[PDB]
């Protein structure tokens, strides 16, 4: 049976999950998927409040293992899995076998430049550019009899707002689409959504295919997909420690432990450069796994014809910290209950959790935080590393990878997300090398935490680099990294980084016994608890920003090209933001936020972001375990 667990933190727990799943305060759709945030007016990472993400599925699988540990009921995370696979994850109709079994290892894809500027799109595809050879997909297909690809696709149109609908329907719910397309400069705000189905019903002559990459004919009717790996990472994290409290209850999950493992053999794909280039070495073509960085990359894509058969894969040679998951990859490759199928799935795992730990250690700042990443694309376009650039296995070291308005690694929310695995690995392992990057981190920022007398707090927000690593020579080691330095911008209270924050200091006081860590995190979750619960759980006013880019964020649209989006908005050069999403107009906080900008204020929000609510939860699950007293 579990061992008993803080009372009053379990409390607060289950409290936060009846706010949570009450149908009174709007958090999930009538099919069951959960929403970005309760408000819609909403522009971050999606555009749109109703609009979600794998990111947060994974968030809610988390939840409801939380649930079933103390309640002793896993039906809630049994249904998080099976709304996952019937609206995350393509079915057959949306990932046709006829053209995923047409794939091709040898020739997995057609490279495509990337730029720097929006402008420069639509990108040419070059046949004769070198492209490496795929070893994984004979693993996969041959494990479990079919071509189609089991991970989730990272952002879904929950209620059919675009307008889109399902595989041109424009009547379904919910609606398969995609955003981020054009490079590095191209922001939430410069982005042209679009269907993951494209039969030419919506947009331009030709849909929006025309407007990302451009070819020698006539471009065909066809379906592409992309994953967010630190998502299913996530997912398969969580479904860890449901099997854990099901089994120390006498209960089962076996049914969801076989999708997560299946979903992590998919995984792999992450592991590989973008266009499968020797990593280290990207004008020569791969020849397998020598085109493997073994990191969690910035997504693997697929697609394929509609009315044709073909179809391709792609890595990402864009690798951020942010994304690592070290507990992941040691659950996979060392727990017997999540040994993946193919032939090398579980062993893959073990060489990416060696090379995780390389790559965070690599990045530890002389303060303690974790910079950017690195890459094997350079300006992605497999270009020369400028002479002075550290490196790690090849890659050069880029300060934000794949963004820059903004940059990827100026939220301190990475540095928490992804340290918060390092904890937990530590925690169940011991492990050395995550240790020494915990007593450092940890360090760092217990100092940078600040909490008033009238019980508010902060913590940092958005921070700022300078220098770069040292070359990693795995040998050598660690040098320290004096010429790395973070600097933070400013603070604020990001009640989700907060949480995630407290989870992390959670499980590393309760191995190293740092009391420093563990009254910290206590103390943040009681602020949080004290001031800033509220009806729907908990919220604080904060400001938006750069929602000018609203009204006054021009998007590029080729010149010539001129499409509609389902509603009717005209796409057009000259086109704003707004112009091509008329129905935020319609927007309960619309002239709020309108007045507000006329007026020349920053507008302001009381925001409900689902995946804050459930890291508070979640934060508050892990506290009453790991300290009983
Ligand atoms: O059209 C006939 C040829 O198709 C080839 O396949 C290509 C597709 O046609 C094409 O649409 C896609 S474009 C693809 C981008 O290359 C990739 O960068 C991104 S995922 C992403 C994530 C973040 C950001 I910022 C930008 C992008 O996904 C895009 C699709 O959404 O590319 C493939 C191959 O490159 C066939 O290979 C060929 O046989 C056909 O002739
Ligand atoms: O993609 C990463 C995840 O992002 C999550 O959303 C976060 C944003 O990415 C992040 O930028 C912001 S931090 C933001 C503050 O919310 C805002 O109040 C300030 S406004 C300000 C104030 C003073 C001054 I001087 C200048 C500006 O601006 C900050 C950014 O500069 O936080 C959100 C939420 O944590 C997504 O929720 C998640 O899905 C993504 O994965
Ligand atoms: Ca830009």
Request: aromatic fraction near 18%; glycine fraction near 10%.
């Given at each position: 049976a579990s061992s008993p667990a803080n009372k009053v933190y379990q409390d607060r727990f289950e409290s936060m999950y009846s706010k949570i799943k009450d149908?009174?305060?709007?958090?999930?759709?009538?099919?069951g998927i959960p929403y970005?945030?309760?408000?819609?007016?909403m522009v971050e990472?999606?555009?749109?409040?109703?609009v979600t993400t794998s990111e947060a599925m994974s968030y809610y699988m988390w939840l409801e293992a939380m649930h079933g540990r103390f309640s002793g009921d896993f039906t809630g995370f049994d249904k998080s899995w099976s709304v996952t696979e019937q609206y995350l994850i393509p079915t057959e109709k949306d990932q046709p076998n006829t053209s995923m079994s047409r794939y091709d290892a040898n020739k997995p894809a057609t490279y495509a430049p990337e730029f720097?500027?929006?402008?420069?799109?639509?990108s040419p595809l070059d046949t004769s550019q070198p492209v490496g050879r795929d070893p994984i997909n004979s693993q996969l297909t041959s494990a479990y009899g079919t071509s189609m690809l089991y991970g989730m696709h990272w952002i879904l149109d929950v209620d059919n707002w675009y307008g889109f609908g399902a595989r041109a329907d424009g009547?379904?719910?919910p609606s398969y689409i995609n955003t981020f397309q054009?490079?590095?400069?191209?922001s939430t705000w410069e982005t042209i959504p679009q269907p993951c189905?494209?039969?030419?019903?919506?947009?331009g002559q030709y849909g929006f295919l025309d407007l990302f990459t451009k070819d020698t004919g006539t471009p065909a009717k066809q379906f592409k997909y992309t994953n967010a790996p630190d998502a299913d990472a996530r997912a398969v994290q969580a479904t860890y420690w449901a099997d854990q409290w099901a089994k120390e209850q006498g209960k089962s999950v076996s049914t969801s432990v076989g999708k997560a493992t299946k979903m992590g053999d998919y995984l792999?794909?992450?592991?590989?450069?973008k266009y499968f280039r020797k990593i280290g070495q990207p004008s020569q073509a791969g020849?397998?796994?020598?085109?493997?960085?073994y990191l969690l990359s910035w997504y693997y894509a697929w697609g394929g014809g509609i009315d044709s058969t073909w179809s391709w894969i792609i890595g990402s040679s864009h690798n951020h910290?942010?994304?690592?998951?070290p507990f992941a990859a040691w659950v996979l490759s060392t727990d017997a209950n999540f040994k993946?199928?193919?032939?090398?799935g579980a062993s893959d795992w073990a060489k990416s959790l060696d090379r995780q730990l390389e790559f965070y250690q690599w990045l530890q700042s002389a303060e303690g935080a974790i910079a950017g990443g690195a890459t094997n694309s350079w300006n992605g376009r497999y270009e020369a590393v400028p002479s002075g650039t550290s490196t790690f296995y090849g890659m050069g070291y880029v300060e934000?990878?794949?963004?820059?308005?903004?940059?990827?690694?100026?939220?301190?929310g990475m540095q928490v997300w992804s340290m918060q695995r390092v904890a937990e690995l530590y925690y169940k392992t011991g492990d050395a090398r995550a240790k020494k990057l915990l007593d450092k981190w940890a360090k760092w920022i217990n100092g940078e935490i600040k909490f008033n007398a009238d019980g508010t707090f902060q913590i940092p927000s958005t921070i700022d680099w300078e220098g770069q690593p040292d070359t990693w020579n795995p040998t050598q080691?660690?040098?320290?990294?004096?010429?790395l330095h973070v600097k933070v911008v400013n603070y604020g209270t990001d009640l989700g980084c907060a949480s995630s924050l407290a989870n992390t200091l959670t499980y590393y006081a309760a191995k190293s016994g740092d009391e420093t860590s563990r009254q910290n995190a206590q103390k943040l979750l009681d602020a949080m608890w004290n001031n800033y619960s509220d009806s729907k759980g908990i919220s604080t006013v904060e400001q938006?920003?750069?929602?000018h880019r609203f009204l006054d964020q021009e998007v590029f649209v080729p010149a010539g090209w001129t499409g509609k989006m389902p509603n009717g908005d005209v796409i057009k050069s000259?086109?704003?933001?707004?112009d091509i999403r008329?129905?935020?107009?319609?927007?309960?906080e619309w002239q709020t936020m309108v007045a507000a900008l006329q007026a020349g204020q920053v507008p302001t929000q009381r925001l409900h972001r689902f995946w804050a609510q459930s890291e508070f939860a979640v934060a508050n699950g892990v506290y009453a375990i790991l300290f009983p007293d």
């Open positions: 149908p009174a305060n709007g958090y999930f759709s009538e099919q970005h945030s309760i408000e819609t007016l990472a999606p555009d749109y409040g109703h720097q500027d929006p402008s420069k799109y639509p009547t379904s719910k054009r490079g590095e400069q191209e189905w494209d039969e030419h019903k919506f947009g792999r794909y992450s592991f590989f450069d020849t397998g796994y020598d085109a493997a960085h910290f942010g994304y690592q998951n993946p199928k193919s032939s090398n934000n990878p794949v963004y820059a308005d903004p940059g990827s690694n100026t939220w301190f080691g660690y040098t320290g990294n004096a010429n938006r920003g750069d929602y000259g086109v704003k933001f707004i008329s129905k935020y107009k319609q927007d309960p």
